[PDB]
Amino acid sequence: KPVKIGPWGGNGGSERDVQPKPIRMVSMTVSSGAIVDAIAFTYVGTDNVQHSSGIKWGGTGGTEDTINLDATNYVTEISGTVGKFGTDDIVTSLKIITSKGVTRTYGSGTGIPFRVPVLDGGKIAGFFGRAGAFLDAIGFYITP
Amino acid sequence: KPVKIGPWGGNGGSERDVQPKPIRMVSMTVSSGAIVDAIAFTYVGTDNVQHSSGIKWGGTGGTEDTINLDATNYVTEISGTVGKFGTDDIVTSLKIITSKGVTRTYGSGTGIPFRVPVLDGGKIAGFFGRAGAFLDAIGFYITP
């Protein structure tokens, strides 16, 4: 069963979550440009079945990038910033680090930093948050 | 069973951890004044036995304050700040929130904030980190 922590960001947009909850992440897709426009992911649930988060959480801007994950290549740390974009506090940048040390950076924005490093073979299993035109807020599911 | 995340803080101090790992926190004691001088806790381990973290993690400054906890009165969120105090980046403040609404604030908010809100009945079960004269860095064990 995952732990659920967060989210980091503003209170705009609509709330986003998944059912069933995730125990490991299979892929994630971030849409980004100057800031983080949207996120989507696929995962194995608490039922040991694969599921999608469905339509991307956020708007139509930016470009998509997908990370494929497996038992040896999993997300061990996520960081980012919360800042203004227009009059909304949103996720202005996001950085993903995997267990092989590869880092991907999404957005070029600034603001109040957040960072969640997961230790001892634990992993980020998936996401929840808030989104509208952009990614207002992001939180994490984590399994040991 | 717990997830292990963090730490937040500077790079100084000696590494501090507990064995066995915690599944429930029973009490925690923060020593603080202007900053966070030390932390200690007692917990139920993965062996279903009560254990201490031992001597406090940090120095002899500040005043001690103890929170008593159990399965239904648990820490649901910890936040704080990491900042320079003298020559060291340390945990300059901590805020503890319990499931019953008990709040305690320790130290002074100088530097960069962090927050770990735990949702859906998850709980902070204990701590690890780095310490010397002060609490250099703090991380969490979290159970779902």
Side-chain angles (χ1 to χ4, degrees), chain A residues 26-51:
Chain A
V26 173
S27 73
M28 57 176 287
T29 303
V30 179
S31 302
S32 67
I35 54 65
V36 183
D37 295 82
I39 197 164
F41 68 106
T42 71
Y43 66 96
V44 176
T46 53
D47 58 355
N48 297 301
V49 173
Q50 283 202 202
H51 303 274

mmCIF file of all heavy atoms in Angstrom, chain A residues 26-51:
data_model
loop_
_atom_site.group_PDB
_atom_site.id
_atom_site.type_symbol
_atom_site.label_atom_id
_atom_site.label_comp_id
_atom_site.label_asym_id
_atom_site.label_seq_id
_atom_site.Cartn_x
_atom_site.Cartn_y
_atom_site.Cartn_z
ATOM 1 N N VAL A 26 4.931 2.503 -14.135
ATOM 2 C CA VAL A 26 5.382 1.878 -15.403
ATOM 3 C C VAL A 26 5.919 2.924 -16.388
ATOM 4 O O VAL A 26 6.901 2.696 -17.051
ATOM 5 C CB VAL A 26 4.221 1.051 -15.988
ATOM 6 C CG1 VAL A 26 4.577 0.528 -17.372
ATOM 7 C CG2 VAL A 26 3.817 -0.073 -15.041
ATOM 8 N N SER A 27 5.255 4.063 -16.473
ATOM 9 C CA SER A 27 5.702 5.157 -17.338
ATOM 10 C C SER A 27 5.170 6.453 -16.761
ATOM 11 O O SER A 27 4.163 6.452 -16.048
ATOM 12 C CB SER A 27 5.276 4.955 -18.764
ATOM 13 O OG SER A 27 3.873 5.189 -18.911
ATOM 14 N N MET A 28 5.828 7.554 -17.113
ATOM 15 C CA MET A 28 5.253 8.880 -16.838
ATOM 16 C C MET A 28 5.555 9.764 -18.026
ATOM 17 O O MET A 28 6.603 9.633 -18.676
ATOM 18 C CB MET A 28 5.767 9.477 -15.531
ATOM 19 C CG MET A 28 7.223 9.608 -15.414
ATOM 20 S SD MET A 28 7.814 10.415 -13.902
ATOM 21 C CE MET A 28 7.360 12.082 -14.260
ATOM 22 N N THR A 29 4.626 10.674 -18.291
ATOM 23 C CA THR A 29 4.715 11.602 -19.410
ATOM 24 C C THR A 29 4.457 13.001 -18.930
ATOM 25 O O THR A 29 3.359 13.300 -18.403
ATOM 26 C CB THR A 29 3.720 11.221 -20.506
ATOM 27 O OG1 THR A 29 3.972 9.864 -20.934
ATOM 28 C CG2 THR A 29 3.826 12.153 -21.697
ATOM 29 N N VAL A 30 5.449 13.854 -19.045
ATOM 30 C CA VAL A 30 5.340 15.271 -18.644
ATOM 31 C C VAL A 30 5.241 16.116 -19.892
ATOM 32 O O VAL A 30 6.041 15.941 -20.831
ATOM 33 C CB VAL A 30 6.519 15.675 -17.754
ATOM 34 C CG1 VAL A 30 6.386 17.137 -17.383
ATOM 35 C CG2 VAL A 30 6.599 14.808 -16.537
ATOM 36 N N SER A 31 4.279 17.037 -19.885
ATOM 37 C CA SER A 31 4.132 18.046 -20.950
ATOM 38 C C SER A 31 4.674 19.351 -20.400
ATOM 39 O O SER A 31 4.235 19.786 -19.333
ATOM 40 C CB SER A 31 2.691 18.206 -21.348
ATOM 41 O OG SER A 31 2.145 16.956 -21.796
ATOM 42 N N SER A 32 5.632 19.972 -21.102
ATOM 43 C CA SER A 32 6.264 21.163 -20.524
ATOM 44 C C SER A 32 6.805 22.054 -21.605
ATOM 45 O O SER A 32 7.064 21.625 -22.716
ATOM 46 C CB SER A 32 7.338 20.811 -19.525
ATOM 47 O OG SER A 32 8.445 20.181 -20.137
ATOM 48 N N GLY A 33 6.994 23.317 -21.197
ATOM 49 C CA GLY A 33 7.610 24.347 -22.046
ATOM 50 C C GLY A 33 8.382 25.253 -21.127
ATOM 51 O O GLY A 33 9.322 24.791 -20.462
ATOM 52 N N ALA A 34 7.929 26.491 -20.934
ATOM 53 C CA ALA A 34 8.513 27.350 -19.885
ATOM 54 C C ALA A 34 8.205 26.803 -18.495
ATOM 55 O O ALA A 34 9.011 26.973 -17.598
ATOM 56 C CB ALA A 34 7.995 28.754 -20.029
ATOM 57 N N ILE A 35 7.046 26.182 -18.329
ATOM 58 C CA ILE A 35 6.619 25.632 -17.019
ATOM 59 C C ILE A 35 6.053 24.226 -17.251
ATOM 60 O O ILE A 35 6.206 23.684 -18.362
ATOM 61 C CB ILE A 35 5.625 26.604 -16.316
ATOM 62 C CG1 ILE A 35 4.415 26.997 -17.152
ATOM 63 C CG2 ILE A 35 6.374 27.868 -15.868
ATOM 64 C CD1 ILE A 35 3.430 25.892 -17.511
ATOM 65 N N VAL A 36 5.462 23.623 -16.232
ATOM 66 C CA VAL A 36 4.897 22.257 -16.383
ATOM 67 C C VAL A 36 3.420 22.368 -16.754
ATOM 68 O O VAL A 36 2.585 22.808 -15.936
ATOM 69 C CB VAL A 36 5.124 21.403 -15.147
ATOM 70 C CG1 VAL A 36 4.574 19.995 -15.406
ATOM 71 C CG2 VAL A 36 6.620 21.363 -14.816
ATOM 72 N N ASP A 37 3.102 22.022 -17.976
ATOM 73 C CA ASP A 37 1.741 22.109 -18.532
ATOM 74 C C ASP A 37 0.863 20.952 -18.060
ATOM 75 O O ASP A 37 -0.343 21.174 -17.891
ATOM 76 C CB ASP A 37 1.766 22.107 -20.071
ATOM 77 C CG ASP A 37 2.447 23.337 -20.609
ATOM 78 O OD1 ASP A 37 3.682 23.377 -20.681
ATOM 79 O OD2 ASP A 37 1.701 24.324 -20.951
ATOM 80 N N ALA A 38 1.397 19.738 -17.959
ATOM 81 C CA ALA A 38 0.533 18.563 -17.683
ATOM 82 C C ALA A 38 1.386 17.389 -17.260
ATOM 83 O O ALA A 38 2.605 17.323 -17.567
ATOM 84 C CB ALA A 38 -0.306 18.154 -18.890
ATOM 85 N N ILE A 39 0.767 16.448 -16.561
ATOM 86 C CA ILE A 39 1.415 15.155 -16.257
ATOM 87 C C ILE A 39 0.435 14.021 -16.447
ATOM 88 O O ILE A 39 -0.786 14.209 -16.272
ATOM 89 C CB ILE A 39 2.003 15.178 -14.829
ATOM 90 C CG1 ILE A 39 3.022 14.045 -14.637
ATOM 91 C CG2 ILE A 39 0.936 15.212 -13.759
ATOM 92 C CD1 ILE A 39 3.897 14.219 -13.434
ATOM 93 N N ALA A 40 0.943 12.864 -16.814
ATOM 94 C CA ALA A 40 0.150 11.633 -16.944
ATOM 95 C C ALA A 40 1.078 10.472 -16.579
ATOM 96 O O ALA A 40 2.319 10.605 -16.632
ATOM 97 C CB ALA A 40 -0.331 11.497 -18.370
ATOM 98 N N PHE A 41 0.510 9.327 -16.234
ATOM 99 C CA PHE A 41 1.365 8.185 -15.890
ATOM 100 C C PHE A 41 0.575 6.889 -16.048
ATOM 101 O O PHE A 41 -0.658 6.881 -16.087
ATOM 102 C CB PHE A 41 1.984 8.305 -14.496
ATOM 103 C CG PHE A 41 1.027 8.200 -13.343
ATOM 104 C CD1 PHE A 41 1.016 7.049 -12.587
ATOM 105 C CD2 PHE A 41 0.197 9.240 -12.994
ATOM 106 C CE1 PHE A 41 0.160 6.919 -11.491
ATOM 107 C CE2 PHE A 41 -0.668 9.097 -11.915
ATOM 108 C CZ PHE A 41 -0.683 7.948 -11.172
ATOM 109 N N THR A 42 1.307 5.792 -16.127
ATOM 110 C CA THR A 42 0.749 4.430 -16.093
ATOM 111 C C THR A 42 1.427 3.688 -14.949
ATOM 112 O O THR A 42 2.558 4.001 -14.600
ATOM 113 C CB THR A 42 0.879 3.716 -17.428
ATOM 114 O OG1 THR A 42 2.226 3.391 -17.664
ATOM 115 C CG2 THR A 42 0.359 4.529 -18.601
ATOM 116 N N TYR A 43 0.725 2.711 -14.389
ATOM 117 C CA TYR A 43 1.174 2.162 -13.087
ATOM 118 C C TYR A 43 0.589 0.776 -12.894
ATOM 119 O O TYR A 43 -0.344 0.369 -13.561
ATOM 120 C CB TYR A 43 0.751 3.079 -11.952
ATOM 121 C CG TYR A 43 -0.726 3.197 -11.727
ATOM 122 C CD1 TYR A 43 -1.379 2.428 -10.771
ATOM 123 C CD2 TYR A 43 -1.509 4.122 -12.420
ATOM 124 C CE1 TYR A 43 -2.707 2.584 -10.504
ATOM 125 C CE2 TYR A 43 -2.866 4.273 -12.180
ATOM 126 C CZ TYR A 43 -3.473 3.506 -11.190
ATOM 127 O OH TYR A 43 -4.827 3.687 -10.961
ATOM 128 N N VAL A 44 1.189 0.059 -11.959
ATOM 129 C CA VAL A 44 0.611 -1.176 -11.380
ATOM 130 C C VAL A 44 -0.093 -0.796 -10.089
ATOM 131 O O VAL A 44 0.474 -0.126 -9.262
ATOM 132 C CB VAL A 44 1.687 -2.249 -11.158
ATOM 133 C CG1 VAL A 44 1.131 -3.490 -10.478
ATOM 134 C CG2 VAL A 44 2.375 -2.614 -12.467
ATOM 135 N N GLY A 45 -1.357 -1.175 -9.976
ATOM 136 C CA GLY A 45 -2.178 -0.820 -8.781
ATOM 137 C C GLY A 45 -1.945 -1.768 -7.619
ATOM 138 O O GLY A 45 -1.233 -2.798 -7.739
ATOM 139 N N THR A 46 -2.612 -1.475 -6.505
ATOM 140 C CA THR A 46 -2.641 -2.349 -5.306
ATOM 141 C C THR A 46 -3.222 -3.718 -5.644
ATOM 142 O O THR A 46 -3.046 -4.656 -4.859
ATOM 143 C CB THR A 46 -3.425 -1.654 -4.183
ATOM 144 O OG1 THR A 46 -4.690 -1.275 -4.718
ATOM 145 C CG2 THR A 46 -2.707 -0.464 -3.625
ATOM 146 N N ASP A 47 -3.966 -3.813 -6.728
ATOM 147 C CA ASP A 47 -4.545 -5.083 -7.250
ATOM 148 C C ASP A 47 -3.542 -5.867 -8.116
ATOM 149 O O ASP A 47 -3.921 -6.914 -8.605
ATOM 150 C CB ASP A 47 -5.808 -4.764 -8.028
ATOM 151 C CG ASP A 47 -5.665 -3.806 -9.209
ATOM 152 O OD1 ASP A 47 -4.558 -3.267 -9.406
ATOM 153 O OD2 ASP A 47 -6.698 -3.597 -9.941
ATOM 154 N N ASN A 48 -2.294 -5.379 -8.298
ATOM 155 C CA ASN A 48 -1.251 -6.022 -9.149
ATOM 156 C C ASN A 48 -1.686 -6.071 -10.607
ATOM 157 O O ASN A 48 -1.224 -6.964 -11.353
ATOM 158 C CB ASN A 48 -0.871 -7.398 -8.634
ATOM 159 C CG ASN A 48 -0.270 -7.286 -7.269
ATOM 160 O OD1 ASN A 48 0.740 -6.603 -7.107
ATOM 161 N ND2 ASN A 48 -0.840 -7.999 -6.307
ATOM 162 N N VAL A 49 -2.515 -5.133 -11.030
ATOM 163 C CA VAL A 49 -2.944 -4.949 -12.430
ATOM 164 C C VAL A 49 -2.403 -3.620 -12.952
ATOM 165 O O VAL A 49 -2.330 -2.648 -12.178
ATOM 166 C CB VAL A 49 -4.486 -4.994 -12.491
ATOM 167 C CG1 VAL A 49 -5.017 -4.647 -13.860
ATOM 168 C CG2 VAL A 49 -5.022 -6.341 -11.968
ATOM 169 N N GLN A 50 -2.094 -3.509 -14.220
ATOM 170 C CA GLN A 50 -1.696 -2.250 -14.848
ATOM 171 C C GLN A 50 -2.900 -1.370 -15.143
ATOM 172 O O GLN A 50 -3.920 -1.831 -15.671
ATOM 173 C CB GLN A 50 -0.899 -2.497 -16.134
ATOM 174 C CG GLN A 50 0.530 -2.911 -15.889
ATOM 175 C CD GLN A 50 1.456 -2.663 -17.069
ATOM 176 O OE1 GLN A 50 2.497 -3.297 -17.160
ATOM 177 N NE2 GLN A 50 1.213 -1.605 -17.832
ATOM 178 N N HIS A 51 -2.755 -0.080 -14.851
ATOM 179 C CA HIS A 51 -3.789 0.946 -15.082
ATOM 180 C C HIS A 51 -3.146 2.201 -15.659
ATOM 181 O O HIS A 51 -1.933 2.441 -15.464
ATOM 182 C CB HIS A 51 -4.484 1.353 -13.762
ATOM 183 C CG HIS A 51 -5.124 0.227 -13.013
ATOM 184 N ND1 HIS A 51 -6.418 -0.156 -13.318
ATOM 185 C CD2 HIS A 51 -4.691 -0.583 -12.011
ATOM 186 C CE1 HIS A 51 -6.729 -1.201 -12.571
ATOM 187 N NE2 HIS A 51 -5.699 -1.495 -11.783
#
